[PDB]
Amino acid sequence: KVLRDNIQGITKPAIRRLARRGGVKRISGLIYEETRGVLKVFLENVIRDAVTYTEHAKRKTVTAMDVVYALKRQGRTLYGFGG
Amino acid sequence: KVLRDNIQGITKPAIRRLARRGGVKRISGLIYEETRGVLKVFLENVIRDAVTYTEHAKRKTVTAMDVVYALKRQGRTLYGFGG
Amino acid sequence: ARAKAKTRSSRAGLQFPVGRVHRLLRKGNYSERVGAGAPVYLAAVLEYLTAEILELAGNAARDNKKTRIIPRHLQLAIRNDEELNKLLGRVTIAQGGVLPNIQAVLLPK
Amino acid sequence: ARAKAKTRSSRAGLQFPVGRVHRLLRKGNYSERVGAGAPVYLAAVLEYLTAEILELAGNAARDNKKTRIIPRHLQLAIRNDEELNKLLGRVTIAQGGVLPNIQAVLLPK
Amino acid sequence: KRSRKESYSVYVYKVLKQVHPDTGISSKAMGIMNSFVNDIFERIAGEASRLAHYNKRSTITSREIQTAVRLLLPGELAKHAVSEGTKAVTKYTSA
Amino acid sequence: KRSRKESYSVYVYKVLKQVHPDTGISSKAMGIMNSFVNDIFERIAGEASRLAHYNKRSTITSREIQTAVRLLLPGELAKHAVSEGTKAVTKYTSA
Amino acid sequence: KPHRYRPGTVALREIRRYQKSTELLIRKLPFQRLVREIAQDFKTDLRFQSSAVMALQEASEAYLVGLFEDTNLAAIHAKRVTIMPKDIQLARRIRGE
Amino acid sequence: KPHRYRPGTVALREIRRYQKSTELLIRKLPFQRLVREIAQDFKTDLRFQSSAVMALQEASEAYLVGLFEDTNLAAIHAKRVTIMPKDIQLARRIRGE
Amino acid sequence: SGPPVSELITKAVAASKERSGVSLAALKKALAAAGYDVEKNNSRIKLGLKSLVSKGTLVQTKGTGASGSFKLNKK
DNA sequence: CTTAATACTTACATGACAGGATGTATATATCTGACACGTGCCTGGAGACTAGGGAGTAATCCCCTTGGCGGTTAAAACGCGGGGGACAGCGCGTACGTGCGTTTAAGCGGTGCTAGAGCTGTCTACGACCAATTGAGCGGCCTCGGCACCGGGATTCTCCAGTATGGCGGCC
DNA sequence: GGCCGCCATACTGGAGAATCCCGGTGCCGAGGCCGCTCAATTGGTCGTAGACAGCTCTAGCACCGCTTAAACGCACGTACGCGCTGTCCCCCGCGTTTTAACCGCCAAGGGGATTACTCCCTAGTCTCCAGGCACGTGTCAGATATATACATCCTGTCATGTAAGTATTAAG
């Protein structure tokens, strides 16, 4: 039923690969938890807006177009899922 | 009537005063002319927008409301000027 | 002949003009039709926000031994509140100055 | 005795639907009326921009020896044009990848 | 002969004298109040218009504005904002 | 069947064949272009609404749209878009 | 002796590869578990479209692209090549949050 | 001897004073001449409301204040007290200029 | 060819003899003033400026290894 | 006697503690103009009623999300090592930081101009609303070859071992 | 001190593998074809929106005249960035092991969406009254000015920690 730790499910090699896409070659040992924290807080900043949209839509199923609105509110305008 | 070299009209000690308001302890000699260029580009963008407001209004005198609109469309919203 | 009218601001018992906010919403091109609770809700929100910031400005003015608000007090009030800073991170204030803020390396010893 | 109804896009010789754009502006609530040349001009601007970006996409796909547009080609086309980069700096592309971008200090001797 | 120019003067004056009966007002601080009222009003009104578009509702009620407060206003103030809004709509329906 | 959901597929397809008769397009790129055209459409719409606000105009005309282009769109592509838009509204004006 | 690359050679090769690549780097289902976990931390028992989950994935990945690019710029400006959370905090502060 | 303060003492005194102060730090007349100069380069004989000129003045001042505090954040992140142009370039490019 | 750079470096440090010793910066600029290469041979100077501190003719004042200051021996 | 080891007196810098003086803050008189308070009005807000429409609500269904089961190996993860990184230490050429007089042009006070910013009547252009009509664009399908996936040889990367040169080391 | 040999490190050619480059091959999005529908359209029409015209009047523009504030420039001075190693430190490379992610396969129902129904709910409008801005003024809070008090920061001063020569005396 409940879930308690899935932020660590965003694995360290995944962060390594992302910084390879981000152009970072050497990634300090303190980086990974910092990235987990900032992705953490940013994901509540997203999902709070997205859910607030959703019960404003009176729905129980979260749509991707809600995510698009929540991102463009935060200046993170998305191409590839509109409509 | 023609104005030629008024970018130097914003004096170097005025830049030092601003850096004191910005809290800068030590100001290199290359800071001032770079600052002049950066503010030149910034205010060029702002005056481009605000003039475009002015001829779209079929006016000739630059008004402060157009200044407010031009600043806020660059995400630099200013209060106190009839906005 | 006619019932004697009270303002809808007085019906709410709020100081902000419900009618003026309602007409600026209807003429602001946001929706052609507007629900009744929307402008009174927004006006209550705005009055509460201005009440908070005016309280902060008043206490800041009493701190500086000044009877009247100044935009220096406004700058101190906005920049020293976290949620108001989140509201006004990108907002420029005329004649406000900045926070007294010196970095730790800038201080001697 | 109704005449043959043509289309405003063909009347402007263009491909974007002038009728759809004028409809969406009338029901998008941005003004009470829409000027006569406004949707034609808007559609012309949108089609010209779409024409450049589709030409860039096709050129990038041909340079990548592929005959079908993939979002990688779109990202490489958009981010390599300075004015479109200034248009779409804060815009997220799905599955487009990133520019090949390495700093000179990151490359070895 | 002149034309009237509207501002939010007397309302902010009333609110300040409610929270501080003895505190005075400078005019350019009042300009910052008028511009702040206009700015936040336009932000919330645009958000309400967007929410009305996204739910395909042609009518913006208090629910839309409540959503806009939940979005823009961060947390603790937004919770208090919902509190006066609920009490105000209750007393307005009772009046 | 279902209700028709309008999108910008066929027009992008035609413009692609105008600029590139030889190549194809993926549906994901199609959706990205629909997001592009909708995004820039709403940007220009909001800007033209703001200019109609500032000029107190009940109508957004091609002057407003040209103003919003030259505000939003940078430089030489913007003046080009002016040129083809001007040519388009002239040859539409001449039917 | 096995052939062994110098430090960073595989890292820069990965950099070139993943800049060339367009696919997602996060596992979809543990990410979905985290999304549902934080969702029920706000409202219990939400339902999520899978496409919304991949959209959150790619948005987060784009944010990570941006913030390591800013972080790498800061660390170069910090006269370093190993990035640190101080760089991330600095970039986070400069971006205005 | 005549009294003389060490480098930084008058600097910090000016820092606290101008953080305390709220007035404009720019000579108004050459600023007005410069904005007329730049706007003349776009369209001729352009006229300015003087209040709009002072509004541009404090807008420019506060924009440079934000740029300079970001610059000082970069400089202390680069472990320095003397700001240099790479600080401002980093601030502009990370901020998105 | 010429003489080894040990004689050159000892001449460079014996030219000045400041109370606070010569930096690696000041000594390499002094050797460049002589005309000796300091850019590709900086590995040679790099190993030399710890080999001489280890060998005891010169002692390091305030720095460590090849960093900081250097002064001549007591006798 | 010669010689040598140490300790004690002698030489060098360093930090610890007091004081002024001028800039900055502290206490007191003035005035002014701008906060603030009082008044004309007309625009603004709205009570009643209505028109008419959006929208809340029931239901259902079905499909698209949720739940479960077996197998792979992709991914996670753990750990040894190795070579790169990070960052202090210290010095040094420098590079503004800052004291100070001049100059001058900004600043402050005074005069005339008209550009144009903005109010008001016109009316003529303008563009939306509506009945109907269509045709092009969208829902659905269905083939197919460009692409997804698979397999073999080069290129290139890239490290790894063998040479001048130059610095390092030793004898007579 | 000269002269002569030995190895560390920069050059410099060689080998193995990761991925690019060439085929090969099946396949399932691409796009083309087909039915549908709604959406653009077109013209009357009807109300209405902004450009035009004219005026007007006021605030920026131009010009001027004292007047020192501030820029400028010069010049002493202390501190700043950072260059280069030194030295600890640490995180990728490699490799293996495990484990659940992925796949893929199947059951089942939750609510998303859709249609229907009937009900709220609000914009508009003629009119009516009421407050808030326009505008004028008038009067004390703070700006400004003048005399004090601390700040504070540099300066001046003394004790103290630390480095070093040879007397002296004890042993060869």
Residue numbers in the entry:
A (entry chain F), B (entry chain B): 20 to 102
C (entry chain G), D (entry chain C): 10 to 118
E (entry chain H), F (entry chain D): 30 to 124
G (entry chain E), H (entry chain A): 37 to 133
I (entry chain U): 35 to 109
Authors' text:
Here, we report cryo-EM structures of human H1-containing tetranucleosome arrays with four physiologically relevant NRLs. The structures show a zig-zag arrangement of nucleosomes, with nucleosomes 1 and 3 forming a stack. H1 binding to stacked nucleosomes depends on the NRL, whereas H1 always binds to the non-stacked nucleosomes 2 and 4. H1 contacts DNA with L1, the amino-terminal part of α2 together with L3, and α3 to stabilize the nucleosome and contribute to chromatin compaction.
H1 is absent from the stacked nucleosomes of the 4×177 array, but is present on nucleosome 1 in the 4×187 and 4×197 arrays, and is present on both stacked nucleosomes in the 4×207 array. H1 that is bound to nucleosome 1 always contacts entering linker DNA via its helix α3, whereas H1 on nucleosome 3 uses α3 to contact exiting linker DNA. In all ten focused-refined maps, H1 shows three DNA contacts, similar to what has been described. The H1 loop L3 and the N-terminal part of helix α2 contact nucleosomal DNA near the dyad, helix α3 binds one linker DNA and loop L1 contacts the other linker DNA. We show that, with increasing NRL, the linker DNA emerging from the stacked nucleosomes is more relaxed and permits stable H1 binding.
